[PDB]
Every structure is written in structure tokens, then in C-alpha cells.
């Protein structure tokens, strides 16, 4: 089994202060709702990706499914800000989070899993139909469902997701229904 | 064992549905409630059911009967809980000084 | 009135040691008790605190005396906040 990435959240400093009204009026697919939130929400189409551009020149880029695709979408957002007229430098690009999900191909019985690992797992069925297991060494949060689908979140690199899944796989096989 | 693991599964996974208690409370208030009210009110009523069944199985163990719960152990459960003030009735103006 | 808690309450009685197959009359008594408890709590909550509004704060003051129920409300609220933070 391999976990495929579903969501990459990155951040990039453009270095130049922006007034948001000209970007909202000139650029396409740009949504600005200040009485609601203080950023410009611009979406692109080729890589299905969304950017929140802030007035201090920092940009949050969400939605891509690899590191190179997130970097390429961030470059596209920087050049569409640039060609409007602002002098925009690609100062620092950092990926805040990487999210992956996988299916372990059998039903899982969660009551023994909270019974034997109650130090790291918080499970409340009514609030959410999933078990939050916190791995202490990778620093990942895993939502483990009864149907067999596991969602790994809270990672910076890919190898952390891979090592967390290889860590939590023998426990899940030990607790098969 | 193999029944204790099934019983512990039903002790945790069972809940009253939030789509009906939000319909039930709003028929008493008149206008609207919030999600953090319905989350708490669905949780207290599970403790209150667990206050009765854990005490109605004390009535059945006191008398000479088995685990199936007849209503005799359930009217006696509300009687013993009310004498310890656990069951609140806001229609009986009580008076302690006589 | 119909029974809005017929199948849900049978899982809960099994959760506290009754049987896998309880009696319909016992399930009916439990359902009536739950509806009465919810109604009483809602009236007292409307009286206490903001008149005509039932809030979490009012519900918490009402359940303060009973230890088992107060602990459950606090745990559920804290866990809800934690799950929202994780999301």
C-alpha cells in the first residue's frame, strides 16, 4: 500500500505591499470580501489551485497534489500579480502542510484500538465518526475510520507521511475485525 | 471476552440523533438553539439513560429476577431516583419548613 | 406522538447491561423519561440566564450539582473544541 497525496498547503512571500482593490478589479477569477475576510481569493484552472493573497505581500497557495505542482502554481500566481504592475519577487516559498490518504483493505475494530493505546488515541463516536491517533515521533495526526480508510495530516515532507503509515500499519493489521 | 467487547462497542457508539433533538428542543423554545447546546443536551440524556439502566439493574439484582428488564424494574428505578432528587420536576412547588 | 427513540434506545440499554433484545414496554418507559428530562431541562434553562434563550452556560449551571453529568458535558465540549482545532 502507498499513500497518495491529496492536498498541499504552501506559503510564499512576494515582498511588496499590495492594495487589494486594483488586484480585485483587474485580475480574473479574483474574489475579495473584506467585511468577511481580508484577502483576495484567486483560483486558477489548469492545476486546480486557490490562492489567498494578502495586503502585506504574503500568499497562501492551497489545493495542488505534489510539491512541484504547488511550486508551479505559486509561480503562476506570482507572475499574474507581476503583470498587473506590482514589482513582485519570489522571496521565500515554504510548504506549510502535506495531506495524504490511503485504504488498508480491511475493516478495523476501533474499540480495541482505543483500549490498548489510550495514551495517544482520542476517540468519541458522537462528535466525529473517526479515531484521532497522534504519533509522537513522526508528529502526524491520523484519522482512522471503521471502513478502512486512513487520513494522514499535519506533515511537512513526504517521508514523514510514509514513515507514519509504515508505523501504524502493523497495529491496524493486529486489530483486524 | 467476546461479549464485553461487543457491549463496550454499543456503550460508546450509541447516541440520540442530533437531527431530532434540535427539532425537539426548538419546539419548546420557539425560535432557535445552537449546535453546542444540542451537543451537550444529547450527551446529558445518555448519562441520564445510564443513570436509570444501571440502577434498574440494581432493582433486578436485588429482587429474584434475571437480566431481561420488565417494567416493574423500571417504575421502581424512577421511584428510587426521585427519592434521591435525581429526577427533576419543575411543576411541584416543594416546601421544607412545616 | 410516535416513538422518535425506539431503535436508538435499544442500543443504549445494551450498552449498560440490559440485553440484546429488550422489551418494547421498557423501551417505551425509557423514551418517555428522556422526553420529560429534556423538556424540564429546557424550561429551567429558558428561566435561568437569558430569558427565552437556552445556552450551554445555562445548561452547565443546571447540571453543576450532579457530578457524572457535569463531567460528561465538560469532556464533550473540550473534545469538540480539540476536533475543530485538528480540522
Amino acid at each position: 500500500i502507498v499513500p497518495q497525496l491529496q492536498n498541499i498547503v504552501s506559503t510564499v512571500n512576494l515582498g511588496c505591499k499590495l492594495d487589494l482593490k486594483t488586484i480585485a478589479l483587474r485580475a480574473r477569477n479574483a474574489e475579495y470580501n473584506p467585511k468577511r475576510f481580508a484577502a483576495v481569493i484567486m483560483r486558477i484552472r489548469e492545476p486546480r489551485t486557490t490562492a489567498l493573497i494578502f495586503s502585506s505581500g504574503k500568499m497562501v497557495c492551497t489545493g495542488a497534489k505534489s510539491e512541484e505542482q504547488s511550486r508551479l502554481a505559486a509561480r503562476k500566481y506570482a507572475r499574474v500579480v507581476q503583470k498587473l504592475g506590482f514589482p513582485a519577487k519570489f522571496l521565500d516559498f515554504k510548504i506549510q502542510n502535506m495531506v495524504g490518504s490511503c485504504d488498508v483493505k480491511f475493516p478495523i475494530r476501533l474499540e480495541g484500538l482505543v483500549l490498548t493505546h489510550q495514551q495517544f488515541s482520542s476517540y468519541e463516536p458522537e462528535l466525529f465518526p473517526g479515531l484521532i491517533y497522534r504519533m509522537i515521533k513522526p508528529r502526524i495526526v491520523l484519522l482512522i475510520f471503521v471502513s478502512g480508510k486512513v487520513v494522514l495530516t499535519g506533515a511537512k515532507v513526504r517521508a514523514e507521511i510514509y514513515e507514519a503509515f509504515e508505523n501504524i500499519y502493523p497495529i491496524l493489521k493486529g486489530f483486524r475485525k | 471476552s467476546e461479549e464485553q467487547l461487543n457491549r463496550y462497542e454499543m456503550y460508546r457508539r450509541s447516541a440520540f440523533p442530533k437531527a431530532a433533538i434540535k427539532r425537539l428542543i426548538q419546539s419548546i423554545t420557539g425560535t432557535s438553539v445552537s449546535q453546542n447546546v444540542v451537543i451537550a443536551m444529547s450527551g446529558i440524556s445518555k448519562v441520564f439513560v445510564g443513570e436509570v439502566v444501571e440502577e434498574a439493574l440494581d432493582v433486578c439484582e436485588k429482587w429474584g429476577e434475571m437480566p431481561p428488564l420488565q417494567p416493574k424494574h423500571m417504575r421502581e428505578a424512577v421511584r428510587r431516583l426521585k427519592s434521591k432528587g435525581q429526577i427533576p420536576n419543575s411543576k411541584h412547588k416543594k416546601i421544607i419548613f412545616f | 406522538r410516535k416513538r422518535l427513540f425506539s431503535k436508538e434506545l435499544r442500543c443504549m440499554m445494551y450498552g449498560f447491561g440490559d440485553d440484546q433484545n429488550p422489551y418494547t414496554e421498557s423501551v417505551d418507559i425509557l423514551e418517555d423519561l428522556v422526553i420529560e428530562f429534556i423538556t424540564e431541562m429546557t424550561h429551567k434553562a429558558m428561566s435561568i440566564g437569558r430569558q427565552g434563550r437556552v445556552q450551554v452556560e445555562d445548561i452547565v449551571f443546571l447540571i453543576r450539582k450532579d457530578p457524572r453529568k457535569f463531567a460528561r458535558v465538560k469532556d464533550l465540549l473540550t473534545m469538540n473544541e480539540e476536533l475543530k482545532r485538528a480540522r
Binding site: P129 | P71 | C11, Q20, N21
Partner: peptide
């Protein structure tokens, strides 16, 4: 989408195991 379909699977097994036959009492 994962939260929407998995919520009803905690309750679907709560109608297959418990309460198979319906009883009554005098």
C-alpha cells in the same frame, strides 16, 4: 466527503446486531 458517508456506518451496524426480535411482557 469522507465524514459524510462514514457517519452512517456507526449507526447501520446499530440496527443489525442489537434488537433482532421484538419482545413484549404481561
Amino acid at each position: 466527503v469522507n465524514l459524510s458517508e462514514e457517519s452512517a456506518r456507526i449507526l447501520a451496524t446499530n440496527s443489525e446486531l442489537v434488537g433482532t426480535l421484538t419482545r413484549s411482557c404481561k
